[PDB]
Amino acid sequence: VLTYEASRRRCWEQIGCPPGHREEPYLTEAGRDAFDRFCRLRQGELQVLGGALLQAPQPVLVKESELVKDTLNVLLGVVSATFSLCQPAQAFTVKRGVHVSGASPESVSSLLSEVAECGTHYARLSDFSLQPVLDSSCSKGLVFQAFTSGLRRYLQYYRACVLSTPPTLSLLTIGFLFKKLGRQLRYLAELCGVGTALPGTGGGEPRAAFPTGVRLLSYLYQEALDNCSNEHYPVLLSLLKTSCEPYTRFI
Amino acid sequence: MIHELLLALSGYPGSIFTWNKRGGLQVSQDFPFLHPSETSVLNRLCRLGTDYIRFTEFIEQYTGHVGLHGIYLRAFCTGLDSVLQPYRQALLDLEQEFLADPHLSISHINYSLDQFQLLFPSVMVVVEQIKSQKIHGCQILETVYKHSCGGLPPVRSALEKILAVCHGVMYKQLSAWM
């Protein structure tokens, strides 16, 4: 029974045998339980002063790898178990739940949500460009079919890159890795259809000037000159090539 | 704590670190239970987070539209993003460290990030000078060249990267003309 271990910290406060218990370390030198607890407590103070106007939309959830899985599904285009594409993921409208982080109630959902809104836009944009043929202002047009098919190709590559590169990665890594892809996606969403705060290119509604068919073979040339300033130079070159492929065929 | 710091580096002010349209991200003075020294360190970091937020807003403002205009202005925004990329990488490393030891202290982060407190302000000063003087087209190149004579080696290397992107644009235009 001699085999017990004892503390090697000897303090200058008890001159007998101290237990060794510290002073309840400071908030900023430890977290993950006290972080969330302090955040929840500050939000509780604010909710007391507000009359309970937070109501913890997803106070905690899911985990790391499961929240990452839901976010990766939303980025693929299947809305997450707390996220709808082009729809508020959480029923909290404070930046703890729309929050890169705060450890606050909803803030665990919020770190995902802040990047998620872009992913929901990406999902709806990938649906917009997923089929090469579409009703109304998108029917007929071989250059339009080529453009939409190549965009769906890139959307698919983006969706396979997500939830295949970052399995079980924290939200921060997921968002940092996907920021350079989602910004290009958002630029193309302004260029293309629904999946954006501007439906199509032009307007912000289902009556956007975005051409199709030979009208698109026009439209794209000015859109290509007028903007290529994010990451579209190789992509826009390929898109112009494939859009001209039906035009070049006809000619 | 550590997660909220990473959030602030991600540009989303929280309850302790609040976003002010005028100041950017800053530490809330009202957060109880922090020792004043901890509040001071947090606010020193929050100054960087504020500058990061403002820089991100500027980058989005001047790249996100596909008034000052030009391929040099776009290159400037791309340069700013590429200069924040090393900050993003350092933030990822800090995140991994905090995932490895949840008991890690803020002093470790402040030491690991102190170099960015010096790198970011100089580039932000140069960018704000370009903005305030409405430097346009190749005059942005002129301004960057003038700023390249600065003494900060980290700043020198960052500005060299920006200048290299701008020279790639200048050389493309020169090739087209010539």
Binding site: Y221, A224, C228, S229, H232 | -
Partner: peptide, 26 residues
Amino acid sequence: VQPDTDPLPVLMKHSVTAPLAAHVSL
């Protein structure tokens, strides 16, 4: 024309127009 920093720079259609105009003219 191409504002993304990558006739690789510069967007045009003359690399495609010339082989088409050659046959139109023929």
